[PDB]
Write an enzyme that holds these catalytic residues in place. Structure first.
Site, PDB file in Angstrom:
ATOM      1  CG  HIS A 144      -1.612  -1.234   1.513  1.00 21.43           C
ATOM      2  ND1 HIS A 144      -2.949  -1.407   1.261  1.00 21.43           N
ATOM      3  CD2 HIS A 144      -1.166  -2.403   2.028  1.00 21.43           C
ATOM      4  CE1 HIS A 144      -3.298  -2.634   1.600  1.00 21.43           C
ATOM      5  NE2 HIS A 144      -2.234  -3.262   2.059  1.00 21.43           N
ATOM      6  CE  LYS A 147     -15.020   3.657   3.490  1.00 25.71           C
ATOM      7  NZ  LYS A 147     -14.494   3.970   4.820  1.00 25.71           N
TER       8      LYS A 147
HETATM    9  C1  LIG Z   1     -13.242   4.690   4.665  1.00 23.93           C
HETATM   10  C2  LIG Z   1     -12.498   5.197   5.868  1.00 23.93           C
HETATM   11  C3  LIG Z   1     -11.077   5.636   5.772  1.00 23.93           C
HETATM   12  C4  LIG Z   1     -10.275   5.610   4.505  1.00 23.93           C
HETATM   13  O1  LIG Z   1     -10.531   6.791   3.768  1.00 23.93           O
HETATM   14  P1  LIG Z   1      -9.297   7.352   2.915  1.00 23.93           P
HETATM   15  O2  LIG Z   1      -9.849   8.553   2.198  1.00 23.93           O
HETATM   16  O3  LIG Z   1      -8.879   6.201   2.024  1.00 23.93           O
HETATM   17  O4  LIG Z   1      -8.142   7.756   3.831  1.00 23.93           O
HETATM   18  C5  LIG Z   1     -10.411   6.092   6.911  1.00 23.93           C
HETATM   19  N1  LIG Z   1     -11.011   6.179   8.094  1.00 23.93           N
HETATM   20  C6  LIG Z   1     -12.287   5.816   8.288  1.00 23.93           C
HETATM   21  C7  LIG Z   1     -12.843   5.941   9.662  1.00 23.93           C
HETATM   22  C8  LIG Z   1     -13.118   5.303   7.184  1.00 23.93           C
HETATM   23  O5  LIG Z   1     -14.395   4.947   7.395  1.00 23.93           O
END
Ligand SMILES: *Cc1c(COP(=O)(O)O)cnc(C)c1O
Ligand SMILES: Nc1ncnc2c1ncn2[C@@H]1O[C@H](COP(=O)(O)O)[C@@H](O)[C@H]1O
Length: 806
Positions: free
Chosen positions: A344, A647
């Protein structure tokens, strides 16, 4: 419904027999536990059968090893995967209680920290939903990471005692306990290699069920808890004992510690999982119904989520060669075949390394094995590329410098049969540059698996409104297969459907507006744009870029107070690393701007700044279903992938972002015309770095940038502390490595297009319905089927669990 009736029957008997309490002395937590136990009982029926079915029909087992496991709240996901959500909603109402109230009582599972953690938790659900024979292995952290508390506008770390009242989901298995060995000495006897005079830590497992949607396949998550062995003695043997007891206890205490030599603990943490896991894995292989370890790479799969479980490689060698009496070369081809790696962390620096001295003292046997591996490998390299001295050093597991150090990332490739990347673009950098020499030797090893999000948690749970808008117009089937979202693409022109999309978004915005008003105490305008930028508070994430935007936006309403400007509600969420001086200042800057923007009558409701305290998995399920605009404004050449952005798209949100990571493959999936892409691209970034970046070329030669910056420096937002953001300015002016001013103009003129598109209602929701139609690829099930086929060699849903009885 006899379901509604049955839920009510078990809740009472759980409260009276399990909790041993009457309604007259029961707290809302006593009411949550009784409910949680009722929902767990329905999982147990499947769980027992699923795990016995695997023993019976011996399939290949998948083992996902990760330190991070951002699971979040279980109750809601559990009853949705069971379909009892409605029956429970009615039954809880029938008991004079609110389900939503009880759901808020449940603590966030303190097992994750970021993108890697959620990646694990999503994957775990997908494998369960796809009928796979998978297991999640990790640490049972007692205090998680920490709770964010904004005190006087700054971030304060609070301890996360999420196990104070205890998890009603996990089941402790003290009988399946295993020893983890440390320090000691090595010895070469005629029998075999022996690791003696070792210090021992106990590994106590706690299993939590992972339910699959609709299907009777309910997997298990084994999280290990560190304990110390029990017992004549003096003060010297009492004090060492009581100290050793506690030192063992802080292995499974807190995620990612600093302490400066809390480095050894981080190493100890990694070997605690690796040792505990592998012994349990092997145990299952030999305890299977009916020279033995030939079928191992055909019955066992080990996915190494980042460089954290890198020790599984020399540890498996150890267990096979020293304990199982297996031949080295036989065990080594097994090791390679039963191991797969994932990277990653882009660019070869964030790649995990460890000093040899620290390994010499803690794991003396594992060092010998690593040394042996990093020879039989280098000799093979000296065969293909003779005389090439500089290739040998470039490919060695052992690195030089201020002291010899073991490069765990090299050991991960040398020890794995398949190495993958998170995003196509990123995956190419892994091949071409990060492991250039490892790639030429074995290009078939290197792969790509674009990341995904579980459609149940990141859609069916958080936004059931939008889900049902798709359910009656397509049919539930899209929940199993997300690519069926292109089926609603011709509905871009459907007049009754377009208003029903915005109906959901507004019905979600009001619910989150009430939450915002009640918790933060600010007048929320629901008719305004819900601008969101929720992620890790870091310089490369460019939180400051969004700040500068709202500063100019505030000054524009102060310049022309009469002008009918597009209303907003700028939301910046996330957490700063405790040691990160700059990121803590950045959180203060947001609160400083809010205490100005929100507390001004000239501004009114056309602009509201609001920092989101304690950004978690539970909070994400609230903010994203009610978000208009999504920001992923990271400097190009940084973000490898990112799962956040995914999301948003599915929950109907127009994203703003550079051409980096998940942004590239989203603009590829929905068309760059349907996403607010801005700023420099990777090559322009590279070129600016070639040019030699200067901030004064942008500060002196801009009107509203000069103003916004000298406002921060003057202390327009920190009047009582005018030199508060001295280090923010000094950075953005002299040592800014993420070119913030270079994308200032580009971001704002982009934001103008964002502003005008939101001024039109139908053309905003039309550009939105494109995003929801193309989100299908970004399913976690797609990634799991791709892992199961391109890496794990297993057939998805080939083994299904039948419904049992008693
Ligand atoms: C989905 C999620 C992330 C990851 O989001 P990024 O934009 O990839 O950093 C980080 N923290 C929480 C609490 C999440 O739900
Ligand atoms: N000898 C056995 N006979 C039937 N089922 C078993 C046996 N051993 C283990 N199992 C099943 O496997 C699960 C626990 O063992 P394990 O998978 O090794 O953690 C239980 O759910 C059991 O039902």
């Amino acid at each position: 419904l006899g379901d509604v009736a049955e839920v009510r029957k078990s809740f009472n008997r759980h409260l009276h027999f399990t909790l041993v309490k009457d309604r007259n002395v029961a707290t809302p937590r006593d009411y949550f536990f009784a409910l949680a136990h009722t929902v767990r009982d329905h999982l147990v029926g499947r769980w027992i059968r699923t795990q016995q079915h695997y023993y019976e029909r011996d399939p290949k087992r998948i083992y996902y090893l990760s330190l991070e496991f951002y699971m979040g709240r279980t109750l809601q996901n559990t009853m949705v995967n069971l379909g009892l959500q409605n029956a429970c909603d009615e039954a809880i109402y029938q008991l004079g209680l609110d389900l939503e109230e009880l759901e808020e009582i449940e603590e966030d599972a303190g097992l994750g920290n970021g993108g890697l953690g959620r990646l694990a938790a999503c994957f775990l659900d997908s494998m369960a939903t796809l009928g796979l024979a998978a297991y999640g292995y990790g640490i049972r952290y007692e205090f998680g990471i920490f709770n964010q508390k904004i005190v006087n506008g700054w971030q304060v770390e609070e301890a996360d005692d999420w196990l104070r009242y205890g998890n009603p989901w996990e089941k402790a298995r003290p009988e399946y306990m295993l020893p983890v060995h440390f320090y000691g000495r090595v010895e070469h006897t005629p029998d075999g290699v022996k690791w003696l005079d070792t210090q021992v830590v106990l590994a106590m497992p706690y299993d939590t069920p992972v339910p699959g949607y609709k299907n009777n396949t309910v997997n298990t998550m084994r999280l290990w808890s560190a304990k110390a062995p029990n017992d004549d003695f003096n003060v010297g043997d009492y004090i060492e004992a009581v100290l050793d007891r506690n030192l063992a206890e802080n292995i499974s205490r807190v995620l990612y510690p600093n302490d400066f030599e809390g480095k050894e603990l981080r190493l100890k943490q990694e070997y605690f999982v690796v040792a505990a896991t592998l012994q349990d894995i092997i145990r299952r292989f030999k305890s299977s119904k009916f020279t033995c370890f030939e079928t191992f790479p055909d019955k066992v799969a080990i996915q190494l989520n980042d460089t954290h479980p890198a020790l599984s490689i020399p540890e498996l060698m150890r267990i096979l060669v020293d304990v199982e009496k297996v031949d080295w070369d036989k065990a080594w081809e097994i090791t390679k075949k039963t191991c797969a790696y994932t990277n990653h962390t882009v660019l070869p620096e964030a790649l995990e390394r460890w000093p040899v001295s620290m390994f010499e003292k803690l794991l003396p046997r594992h060092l010998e094995i690593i040394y042996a591996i990093n020879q039989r490998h280098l000799d093979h390299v000296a065969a293909l590329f003779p005389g090439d001295v500089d290739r040998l050093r470039r490919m060695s597991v052992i690195e030089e410098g201020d002291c010899k150090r073991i490069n765990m990332a090299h050991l991960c490739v040398i020890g794995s049969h398949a190495v993958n990347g998170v995003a196509r673009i990123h995956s190419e950098i892994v091949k071409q540059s990060v492991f250039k020499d490892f790639y030429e030797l074995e290009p078939e090893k290197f792969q790509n698996k674009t990341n995904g999000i579980t459609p149940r948690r990141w859609l069916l749970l958080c936004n059931p409104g939008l889900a049902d808008t798709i359910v009656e117009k397509i049919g539930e089937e899209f929940l199993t297969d997300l690519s069926q979202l292109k089926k609603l693409l011709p509905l871009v022109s459907d007049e009754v459907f377009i208003r029903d999309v915005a109906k959901v978004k507004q019905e979600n915005k009001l619910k989150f507006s009430a939450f915002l008003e009640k918790e933060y105490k600010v007048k929320i305008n629901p008719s305004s744009m819900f601008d969101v930028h929720v992620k890790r508070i870091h310089e490369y994430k460019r939180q400051l870029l969004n700040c500068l935007h709202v500063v100019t936006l505030y000054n524009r309403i102060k310049r022309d107070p009469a002008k009918a400007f597009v209303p907003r509600t700028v939301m910046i969420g996330g957490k700063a690393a405790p040691g990160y001086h700059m990121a803590k200042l950045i959180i203060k800057l947001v609160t400083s701007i809010g205490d100005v923007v929100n507390h001004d009558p000239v501004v009114g409701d056309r602009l509201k700044v609001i920092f989101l305290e304690n950004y978690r998995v539970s909070l994400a399920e609230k903010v994203i279903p009610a978000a208009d605009l999504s920001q992923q404004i990271s400097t190009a050449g940084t973000e490898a992938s990112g799962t956040g952005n995914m999301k948003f798209m599915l929950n109907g949100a127009l994203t703003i972002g550079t051409m980096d990571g998940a942004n590239v493959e989203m603009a590829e999936e929905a068309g760059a015309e349907n996403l607010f892409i801005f700023g420099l691209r990777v090559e322009d970034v590279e070129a600016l770095d070639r040019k030699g970046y200067n901030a004064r070329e942008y500060y002196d030669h801009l009107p509203e940038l000069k103003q916004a910056v000298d406002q921060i420096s003057s202390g327009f937002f920190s009047p009582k502390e005018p030199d508060c953001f001295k280090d923010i300015v000094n950075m953005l002016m002299h040592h800014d490595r993420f070119k913030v001013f270079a994308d200032y103009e580009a971001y704002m003129q982009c934001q103008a297009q964002v502003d005008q598109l939101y001024r039109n209602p139908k053309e905003w929701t039309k550009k939105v319905i494109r995003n929801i139609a193309c989100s299908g690829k970004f399913s976690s099930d797609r990634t799991i089927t791709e892992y199961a086929r391109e890496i794990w060699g297993v057939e998805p849903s080939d083994l299904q669990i039948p419904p049992p009885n008693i």
